[PDB]
Design a protein around this ligand. Structure first.
Ligand SMILES: Nc1ncnc2c1ncn2[C@@H]1O[C@H](COP(=O)(O)O)[C@@H](O)[C@H]1O
Ligand SMILES: [Zn+2]
Lengths: 167, 707
């Protein structure tokens, strides 16, 4: 196992080179998840329990009252049930023109909107960018991750599954 | 009555080794923890440990020495820890970025196989020269020296003025193909020198054509930057190391180890050649003995606490790698070739969690030894812990007993980490690891000799390092070596080899001579002229280096050389010129004949395709006091009873066996030791299981047989 501060440095991106190389070449520490979640928990402005981080500021949380599982932004905004695709309840900005493309790429280096489009999915409250898709036009919104939380907690970590209510 | 004459040092390994030898060939080996932040301390402590075995004080011995040689991490750490000057770089306009790009390869140099394919472990070290201290001149010379884009000198003046305004503490110049046609680069060199003079600032200039004129811009530019980045700072470090000895009595100028296996002054003009830290001294030491003993083909084996290093001396000569990489930098330095096989006797032993396979290294406990040292904090077993369980090592005699070892700690850690998971007894688990290690080393020696087109029967094996004599029986078994040799000074052989090295400067230049089999004399006349002109440019560099050290030309012994090959096929040998100079077509015929001779001697020949010269070599040697090799008359086959120092049980081939202990230094030339025995020293242990025999010759070299 690693020192808590080392895992904290990992999250904050301030870890030193020699430890990061260790983590990579040495066998994984089974205790990483429990410590990892706890580190993230004490940094949230809410006490709702994290049960799976989906991104730097996106989490599946247990609502402390209803006990439902929802996708939540670091600021506190709930998107939907954990089974649903949070993007469908978010805000999007699509760069489907050369004008929009050249705001993030130089010309010629930018994709061509008639072939590839860039979609930016934001949080409605704080405006954080949680995911960027780059599909062709017409393409469905991707449901990136459907985790098996019961089997993960129960069979792989040996932990009890958090209390869950139905949506 | 005792006169200590020579001192050899090697601080690049597990710790700081010192080797002292007197007028008769009598020796001591000192061992002490390294102190990289102030290497002087460990050098003094190590020397005091060795001289204590003679009953001598440091103060008394240093006044006697007439020469000494240092090898260690002084230069290496200065590069790795990036503690050099604010050196600047001038290259071709449009290619200012090729230095800091590291050619991509520098993001994974020195990585083990699994780390090399594990992408995320890849990582760039900071560039020696940052971008803001890099400038470019508009010029291009092609591969044959044709000036495609003539030099635009106004861009050189601006580049020079830019770096001077940035307070550059050095300016390196490296243009492409300057090794072919140095006209433009040396013109830029002069322009920089002028603008520096005008500015009144003291800024040295280094032109890659003047320092390392060889192919490969990335190698060459790195190697020249080291002269403007770490050279003078390294001089300061080596001044303190040599001042520490001088203010304590030494009356000689210290020499240091170079990549090419020769020693040079630490005030040399080119000190990038001192970045070497590995135990190449061990290869120079075995060669020095072979010359005196009559061994042309030697397989070197340095089993230390931090590394397993091996190398071959074939027909008296050793292989030189010409474009090596060191300190995660591609460099243009001729390096003595050694192969790393593992992480030393301190290599950690683990069971892969996904596979349960036994994994040695690649990290090592090193000076911390293993779990047997409670105060080290090592919680993971090491190969040394297997030596404790199995009974090869004496817990009460590790570094004379300076290290407090607990064998029971090894038994407990191996039981929980290796044996029980595999379902084995502790002894079988430990013995098994040693079995695995011996096979790796045995096969890697076999394959290496097989690569040169030889069988081990044509070779002799040298086993040194602190842990070499512990495994010699195991990884030499069945290979059929002509002779297996364990030097009585194995624990300091690498340091003995530094003192055995010549005082030898070496300079290299790249060439591209292409010669069909049969050609008119004029063509041969121009080939010799091209090589001769290169020799003349290198001879200047060699003799200048010696002139600064106080030696005149008539004191230097020049040995011209060149790298030649049958066109289309590469080789790993360098040829010593039969001629001090080449002018006629007949002289050229001698050089081609010399290669055919050397090629047939080492190794299949193909004179039909013609010949190619890819490089010229100049070496200059000055005689210096070298360690005397003992040559004592041999005594009785039976060792003195004073040499017997008890018995210890060790485990091998499913058998616990009572082994006779011997005090190595007490044994006499002629003595024969029949296994199972363990010949112990204070910093090395020589294992001789049953089915093996040893005898000691007049040079204090042990010979190992299987009977
Ligand atoms: N009496 C001894 N004292 C200390 N180290 C020893 C002794 N005998 C063998 N060694 C081995 O020598 C290794 C160090 O070798 P070296 O790196 O050449 O100094 C240690 O890791 C041990 O495995
Ligand atoms: Zn938000």
């Amino acid at each position: 196992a690693y020192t808590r501060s080392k895992i904290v440095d990992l999250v904050d991106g301030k870890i030193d080179p020699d430890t990061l190389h260790q983590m990579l070449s040495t066998p994984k520490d089974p205790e990483r998840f429990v410590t990892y979640v706890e580190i993230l928990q004490e940094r949230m402005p809410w006490d709702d329990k994290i049960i799976l981080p989906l991104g730097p500021k996106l989490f599946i949380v247990q609502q402390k009252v209803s006990k439902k599982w929802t996708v939540r932004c670091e600021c506190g905004h709930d998107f939907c049930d954990w089974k649903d695709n949070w993007k469908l309840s978010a805000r999007v900005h699509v760069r489907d023109t050369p004008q929009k493309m050249e705001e993030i790429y130089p010309r010629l280096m930018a994709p061509t909107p008639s072939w590839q489009v860039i979609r930016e999915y934001f949080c409605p409250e704080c405006g954080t960018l949680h995911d960027v898709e780059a599909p062709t036009p017409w393409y469905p919104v991707i449901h990136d991750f459907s985790p098996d939380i019961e089997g993960f907690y129960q069979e792989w970590l040996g932990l009890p599954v958090p209390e869950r209510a139905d949506a | 009555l005792r006169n200590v004459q020579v001192l050899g040092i090697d601080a690049g390994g597990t710790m700081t080794d010192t080797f002292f030898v007197d007028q008769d060939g009598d020796f001591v080996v000192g061992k002490a923890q390294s102190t990289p932040q102030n290497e002087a301390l460990g050098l003094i402590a190590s020397s005091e440990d060795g001289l204590a075995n003679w009953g001598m004080s440091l103060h008394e011995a240093l006044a006697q020495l007439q020469t000494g040689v240092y090898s260690g991490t002084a230069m290496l750490n200065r590069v790795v820890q990036r503690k050099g000057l604010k050196c600047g770089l001038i290259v071709n306009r449009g290619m200012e970025d090729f230095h800091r790009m590291g050619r991509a390869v520098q993001s994974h140099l020195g990585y083990a196989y699994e780390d090399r394919i594990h992408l995320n472990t890849h990582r760039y070290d900071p560039p020696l020269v940052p971008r803001h201290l890099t400038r470019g001149v508009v010029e291009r010379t092609d591969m044959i020296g044709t000036q495609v884009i003539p030099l635009r000198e106004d861009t050189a003046r601006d580049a020079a003025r830019d770096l001077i305004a940035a307070d550059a503490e050095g300016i390196v110049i490296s243009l492409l193909h300057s090794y072919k046609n140095p006209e433009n680069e040396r013109r830029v060199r002069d322009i920089v020198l002028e603008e520096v003079e005008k500015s009144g600032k003291k800024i040295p200039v280094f032109a890659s054509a003047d320092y390392y004129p060889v192919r490969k811009e990335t190698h060459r530019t790195n190697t020249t930057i080291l002269e403007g980045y770490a050279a003078e700072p390294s001089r300061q470090t080596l001044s303190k190391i040599s001042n520490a000895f001088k203010e304590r009595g030494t009356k000689f100028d210290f020499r240091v180890m170079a990549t090419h296996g020769g020693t040079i002054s630490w005030k040399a003009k080119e000190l990038a050649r001192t970045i070497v830290s590995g135990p190449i001294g061990g290869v120079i030491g075995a060669k020095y003995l072979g010359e005196v003993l009559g061994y042309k083909n030697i397989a070197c084996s340095d089993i230390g606490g931090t590394s397993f290093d091996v190398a071959l001396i074939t027909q008296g000569e050793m292989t030189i790698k010409n474009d090596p990489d060191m300190a995660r930098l591609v460099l243009s330095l001729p390096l003595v070739a050694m192969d790393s096989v593992g992480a030393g006797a301190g290599s950690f032993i683990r069971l892969d969690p996904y596979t349960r396979a036994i994994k040695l290294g690649p990290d090592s406990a090193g000076y911390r030894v293993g779990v047997c040292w409670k105060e080290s904090g090592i919680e993971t077993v090491t190969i040394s812990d297997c030596h404790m369980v199995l009974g090869y090592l004496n817990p009460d005699n590790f570094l004379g007993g300076a290290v407090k070892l607990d064998r029971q700690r090894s038994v407990d850690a191996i039981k929980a980490q290796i044996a029980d998971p595999l379902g084995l007894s502790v002894e079988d688990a430990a013995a098994g690891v040693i079995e695995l290690l011996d096979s790796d080393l045995r096969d890697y020696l076999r394959s290496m000799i097989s690569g040169k087109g030889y069988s081990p029967a044509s070779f002799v094996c040298f086993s040194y390092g602190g842990a070499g004599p512990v495994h010699t029986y195991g990884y030499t078994e069945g290979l059929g070596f002509e002779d297996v040799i364990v030097p009585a000074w194995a624990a300091g052989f690498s340091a003995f080899g530094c003192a055995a090295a010549d005082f030898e400067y070496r300079y290299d230049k790249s060439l591209d001579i292409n010669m069909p089999t049969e050609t008119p004399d004029t063509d041969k006349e121009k080939a010799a002229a091209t090589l001769q002109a290169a020799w003349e440019e290198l001879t200047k560099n060699v003799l200048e280096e010696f002139k600064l050290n106080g030696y005149s030309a008539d004191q230097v012994t020049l040995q011209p050389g060149y790298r030649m090959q049958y066109r289309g096929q590469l080789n790993d040998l360098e040829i010593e010129s039969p001629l001090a100079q080449a002018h006629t077509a007949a002289d050229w015929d001698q050089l081609t004949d010399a290669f055919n001779a050397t090629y047939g001697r080492v190794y299949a020949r193909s004179p039909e395709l013609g010949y190619s010269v890819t490089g010229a070599i100049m070496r200059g040697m000055v005689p210096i006091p070298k360690p005397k090799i003992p040559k004592e008359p041999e005594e009785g086959e039976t060792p003195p009873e004073s040499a017997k120092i008890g018995t210890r049980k060790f485990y091998r081939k499913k058998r616990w066996v009572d082994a006779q202990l011997y005090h190595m230094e007490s044994l006499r030339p002629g003595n024969r030791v029949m296994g199972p025995a363990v010949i112990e020293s204070d910093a090395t242990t020589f294992v001789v299981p049953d089915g093996f025999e040893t005898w000691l010759d007049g040079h204090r070299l042990f010979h190992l047989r299987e009977v």
